[PDB]
Curated annotation (Swiss-Prot):
It comes from Homo sapiens. GO terms for molecular function: arylesterase activity; carbonate dehydratase activity; cyanamide hydratase activity; zinc ion binding. Target of drugs used in treatments against glaucoma disorder and breast cancer. The gene is CA2. The record marks 4, 59, 64 as: Fine-tunes the proton-transfer properties of H-64. The record marks 89 as: Involved in the binding of some activators, including histamine and L-histidine. Changing residue 62 to S: 2-fold decrease in enzyme efficiency, as determined by kcat/KM ratio, and efficiently inhibited by chlorzolamide. Catalyzes the reversible hydration of carbon dioxide. Can also hydrate cyanamide to urea. Stimulates the chloride-bicarbonate exchange activity of SLC26A6. Essential for bone resorption and osteoclast differentiation. Involved in the regulation of fluid secretion into the anterior chamber of the eye. Contributes to intracellular pH regulation in the duodenal upper villous epithelium during proton-coupled peptide absorption. Changing residue 139 to F/Y: Strongly impaired activity. This is Carbonic anhydrase 2.
Length: 257
């Protein structure tokens, strides 16, 4: 099945998911001189105070933190969105070395990792129907550079040991996603897709201009995870990012001058 190896990585994905070569694929590079400020954009509203995290899981590709979405407890609205989107899970993409790991880039600059908070449009009722609509999902992407440690990331780092291999999960309650945001909520936005198969075109991306910093010690622990299952030959979970795709007919908008 797909993955990030030589034989089943991103340049093979199109054979099983032809949308890989579609018109609205992600990630892309953000060319800051071709992006345009849009005064019509509103400030993002992140309301995560009643978030209820439930579990963390290694899915062989990656680790996801899952949240209860059976109600409007942790939502995103405003920004370029119409309506309310509920938080369902977050996960990261990272590299084997600090000079790579992000999926988006800025002026071709790569960051060490990138966090994706995934949300779906509650007009559609459940996540499964959201992924059949052009405005079904919203993903908030945050870059990570290596520097100072991020206190709010430490509880995640500390449970990784227990979901080392594919299929392992651990109870992960009362984690507050607010500890992962940067100081500013200025952003870029563009219509795209999920970045792992099935690659569905259902996403309004909101990529925050300010990165968060993590320590070298924190990122190191993500690289000790495994793509394989328990009792199989060890393959470290590193470089699980997809290379930038063609912008094609799309415009990137910025919320800031
Ligand atoms: Zn992602």
């Amino acid at each position: 099945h797909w993955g990030y190896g030589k034989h089943n990585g991103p340049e093979h994905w199109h054979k099983d998911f032809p949308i890989a070569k579609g018109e609205r694929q992600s990630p892309v590079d953000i060319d800051t001189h071709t992006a345009k400020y849009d005064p019509s954009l509103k400030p993002l509203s992140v309301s995560y105070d009643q978030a209820t995290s439930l579990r963390i899981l290694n899915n062989g590709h990656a680790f996801n933190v899952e949240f209860d979405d059976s109600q409007d407890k942790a939502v995103l609205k405003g920004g370029p969105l119409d309506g309310t989107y509920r938080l369902i899970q977050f996960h990261f993409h990272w590299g084997s070395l600090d000079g790579q790991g992000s999926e988006h880039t800025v002026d071709k600059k790569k960051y060490a990792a990138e966090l994706h908070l995934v949300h779906w449009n509650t007009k559609y009722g459940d996540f499964g129907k959201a992924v059949q609509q052009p405005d079904g999902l919203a993903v908030l992407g945050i870059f990570l550079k290596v520097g100072s440690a991020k206190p709010g990331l430490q509880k995640v780092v500390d449970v990784l040991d227990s979901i080392k291999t594919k299929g392992k999960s651990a109870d992960f309650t009362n984690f507050d996603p607010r500890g992962l945001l940067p100081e500013s909520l200025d952003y870029w936005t563009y219509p795209g897709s999920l970045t792992t198969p099935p690659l569905l075109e259902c996403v309004t991306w909101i990529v925050l201009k300010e990165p968060i910093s993590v320590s070298s010690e924190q990122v190191l622990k993500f690289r000790k995870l495994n793509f394989n299952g328990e009792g199989e030959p060890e393959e470290l979970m590193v470089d699980n990012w997809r290379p930038a795709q063609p912008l094609k007919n799309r415009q990137i908008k910025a919320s800031f001058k």
